Amino acid sequence: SVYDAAAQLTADVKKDLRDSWKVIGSDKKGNGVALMTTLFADNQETIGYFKRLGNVSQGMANDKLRGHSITLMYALQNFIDQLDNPDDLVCVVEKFAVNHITRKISAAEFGKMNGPIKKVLASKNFGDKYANAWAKLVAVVQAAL
Amino acid sequence: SVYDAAAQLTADVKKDLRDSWKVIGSDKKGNGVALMTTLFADNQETIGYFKRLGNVSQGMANDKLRGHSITLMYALQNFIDQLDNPDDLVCVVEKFAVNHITRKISAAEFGKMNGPIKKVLASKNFGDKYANAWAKLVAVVQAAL
Numbered sequence A, B: 001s002v003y004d005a006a007a008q009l010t011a012d013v014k015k016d017l018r019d020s021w022k023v024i025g026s027d028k029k030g031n032g033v034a035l036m037t038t039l040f041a042d043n044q045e046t047i048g049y050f051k052r053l054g055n056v057s058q059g060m061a062n063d064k065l066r067g068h069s070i071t072l073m074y075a076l077q078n079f080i081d082q083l084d085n086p087d088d089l090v091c092v093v094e095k096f097a098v099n100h101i102t103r104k105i106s107a108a109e110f111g112k113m114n115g116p117i118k119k120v121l122a123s124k125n126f127g128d129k130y131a132n133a134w135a136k137l138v139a140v141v142q143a144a145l
């Protein structure tokens, strides 16, 4: 279950998530747009899903993309803040899962964000250990898809 | 105009928003659920829109309501964090406006959350001065609906 996936997150994993978030979560606009542009650059097949945002190649200049990117970072902020209470983490994870289920995003497709997260983390010198920690958090959402 | 509305957030209004947010934003789960249950109690006619959440009268015991409520508080956190830059505040406001436009929520009905905000603020000893500052922030979203 989602609860199982959440209850699994260990103290060391939570520590790595919080430590790396202190940095990448400190510039939500910059890193949020970086995540999205990287997704589109490495997984061009996903561009079609974001047609509401207009021309995503405009990057920061695209107000719809910018608004979406900043908001995406607050979803991550939400997750990070609920780490110590699996019950609360689960209910917010399911809320966002619905936002994606209605758009026909499968668990496998949702996992495509792992690549961009790994690259953004690396840009701030957070290595594989941190990328693996984030993949575990993403997997909690995947358990709901 | 959402831009003219954003211009109404003067230095004093911004300070009052930040000062009161430091308190109500400290318990997102508690105060978020309080806002929603107050909305449903004072404005029964809005309950129909929240069909997906199930039995909202269960309050905190309702997992979907709790997930929704916590997330709503992160939308407010988002707005407060964008007060320094109007172009960024506007793009996040328009993102959430779309979330409501698709739900057929008008500016007038969106404004019904002012009552709940005033009550929740008052319960923490923040009076009309603060309620009015928050009404101006809500007015920015209303301009986009």
Ligand code: HEM
Binding pocket: A046, A049, A050, A051, A052, A053, A068, A071, A072, A075, A076, A096, A099, A100, A103, A105, A109, A110, A111, A112, A113, A138, B099
């Ligand atoms: C770290 C992972 C991710 C998080 C935290 C996340 C978060 C969000 C949030 C908060 C929204 C706004 C929901 C709404 O207001 O309706 C959103 C929308 C969306 N997401 Fe994600 N997302 C993630 C990964 C993905 C991936 C990898 C895909 C696709 C392969 C995807 C596809 C979409 C689509 C199509 C939308 C709707 C955009 C729109 O039309 O406004 N998401 N996401």
Ligand code: HEM
Binding pocket: A099, B046, B049, B050, B051, B052, B053, B068, B071, B072, B075, B076, B096, B099, B100, B103, B105, B109, B110, B111, B112, B113, B138
């Ligand atoms: C301070 C004011 C408000 C804020 C910041 C706010 C924020 C939010 C957020 C963040 C969501 C989730 C968006 C999504 O994932 O699609 C949401 C959903 C929703 N909001 Fe609001 N909202 C506010 C006031 C209102 C009011 C007063 C109404 C109705 C009279 C309303 C009706 C809705 C509905 C129907 C949903 C969809 C719930 C669902 O099915 O999940 N909102 N709101």
